[PDB]
């Protein structure tokens, strides 16, 4: 079961929007992802912080790759999805009403069920970005999602605190200022839980993806979870690309997820 | 007269601050600049938008390269310069009181003369980032600057409008929505003026640098201005690095500025 790699190009658009001179060119970057990744992912936020409507249009029109649009439950972006028809839509929280404390989508949101229906009626694959809880997995099955994407964010931060220098830097997370034994127990639980949730997802006929915070060090134990078929990774790849170029950054990640 | 290249690493720090996970690592990037550039430039803004105090400290402590700190006329950053002693300080506007309409430093600012004195008293080289006007060049000589850095920002935007696709994109500048002939006349004047100002600077014993907006296409006519000894370039290099890696991005630029 070869793992698939979705490359989220949001942070290339972050750089672009930082100077407003169309450099880096997101479509150039998308051509490289189309060739060396398995899908192109982007999040067109309601506030248009990074990726834009025209980016989604351009990528759909020009790139030889499946497209995964991440978006929230606002009508404007949903309608855009319905108009342009990316291959897949991954529903993610942006507003408070969509959020949970842990960062996955609130699966009780009033608009969620109809949103899913609208998308599937338009023949768009639907993925729900969720906390790794057995309850959220079972609800996702009930809501008729084809995919779920497990939030690896807490796992990633734990891995970083334990096996890198991040706690000695200005980027240290105050919440992870606890003794190593407690951190190590939480890390093991979090990884165990990701595996349990993937198995549950697979048992219910869902396709299981994982994403948020994955990097070239913390990805390695996630690859060993046989039941995860796809990782969606952005920020760490774009951060590596500053040193190696995007092609090599993607190819390096592909080598790590071989199994 | 081989042209020197200062690499401004601000936009690598922009990426880092976008996710707050110490990736990309600015010190890693600074090691690459130290090796392949001629100086490392960074702007520690009062608002700490990108580069941080600890970045200046780390680079000064660890990197085998001259350091050029860009900063404004606030006491906090000046004191930091005085404490850490980069090789050079380039005084740039951040607040309204420091600004001119065109983007160079206001050379009448009340604190400017004393700021220059404080820095030179500490044996820090001082550069003034200025509009390309003969008047600002003569004042910079009077203020006893060792360097001036000509603002190539208007030149760059003109070049982009004329010789790239930028006017057909969402990044088009409304002010440059004018007919090609007027743009072409303004472009020629702007380039002529940059040359005139460099010659004037050199005539007065100033060292002449140039920066803002320079990229792999618009740099080429600037290299032909014999009297400019140094270019300071950031955003275009970091934008290229996403595709080629920072080493190759720097080396590519170095090849273009050979003369
Ligand atoms: C649902 C989802 N998956 C994966 C990613 C990629 O995450 P990262 O940039 O941390 O790798 C994102 C972007 O935050 C996302 O929203
Ligand atoms: C004085 C000065 N020179 C050069 C640069 C580099 O400019 P750019 O990032 O547009 O190449 C900057 C950063 O805006 C600067 O402040």
UniProtKB/Swiss-Prot annotation, chains A, B:
CDD domains registered for this protein in UniProt: PNPsynthase
GO biological process terms on file: pyridoxine biosynthetic process
Positions that bind 3-amino-2-oxopropyl phosphate: 8, 19, 213, 234-235
Pathway field: Cofactor biosynthesis; pyridoxine 5'-phosphate biosynthesis; pyridoxine 5'-phosphate from D-erythrose 4-phosphate: step 5/5
Residues that bind 1-deoxy-D-xylulose 5-phosphate: 10-11, 45, 50, 100
Entry keyword annotation includes Ribonucleoprotein: no
Subcellular location: Cytoplasm
InterPro entries linked to this entry: Aldolase_TIM, PyrdxlP_synth_PdxJ, Pyridoxine-5'_phos_synth
Cited Gene3D superfamilies: Aldolase class I (3.20.20.70)
Residue positions of the active site: 43, 70, 212
GO molecular function: pyridoxine 5'-phosphate synthase activity
Cellular component annotations (GO), alphabetically ordered: cytosol
Site feature location: Transition state stabilizer: 149
Family: Belongs to the PNP synthase family.
Quaternary state and interactors: Homooctamer; tetramer of dimers.
General function of this protein: Catalyzes the complicated ring closure reaction between the two acyclic compounds 1-deoxy-D-xylulose-5-phosphate (DXP) and 3-amino-2-oxopropyl phosphate (1-amino-acetone-3-phosphate or AAP) to form pyridoxine 5'-phosphate (PNP) and inorganic phosphate.
HAMAP family: PdxJ (MF_00279)
Record-given protein name: Pyridoxine 5'-phosphate synthase
């Amino acid at each position: 079961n070869a793992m698939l790699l979705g490359v989220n190009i949001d942070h290339i658009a972050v750089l672009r929007q930082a100077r407003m001179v169309n450099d880096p060119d997101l479509l150039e970057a998308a051509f490289i992802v189309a060739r060396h990744g398995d899908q192109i992912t982007l999040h067109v936020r309601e506030d248009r912080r990074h990726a834009q409507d025209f980016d989604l249009e351009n990528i759909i029109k020009f790139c030889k790759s499946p497209v995964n649009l991440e978006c929230a439950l606002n009508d404007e972006i949903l309608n855009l999805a319905l108009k342009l028809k990316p291959h897949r839509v991954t529903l993610v929280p942006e507003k408070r009403e969509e959020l949970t404390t842990e960062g996955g989508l609130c699966l009780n949101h009033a608009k969620l069920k109809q949103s899913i229906e609208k998308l599937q009626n338009a023949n768009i694959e639907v993925s729900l970005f969720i906390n790794p809880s057995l309850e959220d997995i079972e609800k996702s099955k009930i809501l008729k999602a084809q995919f779920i994407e497990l939030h690896t964010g807490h796992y990633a931060n734990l891995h970083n605190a334990l096996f890198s220098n991040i706690s000695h830097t200005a980027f240290a997370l105050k919440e992870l200022d606890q003794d190593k034994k407690t951190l190590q127990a939480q890390f093991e639980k979090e990884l165990q839980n990701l595996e349990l949730c993937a198995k549950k997802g697979l048992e219910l006929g869902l396709k299981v993806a994982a994403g948020h915070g994955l990097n070239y060090k913390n990805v390695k134990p996630v690859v060993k979870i046989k039941e995860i078929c796809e990782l969606n990774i952005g920020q760490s790849i774009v951060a590596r690309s500053v040193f190696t170029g995007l092609q090599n950054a993607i190819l390096e990640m592909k080598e790590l997820i071989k199994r």
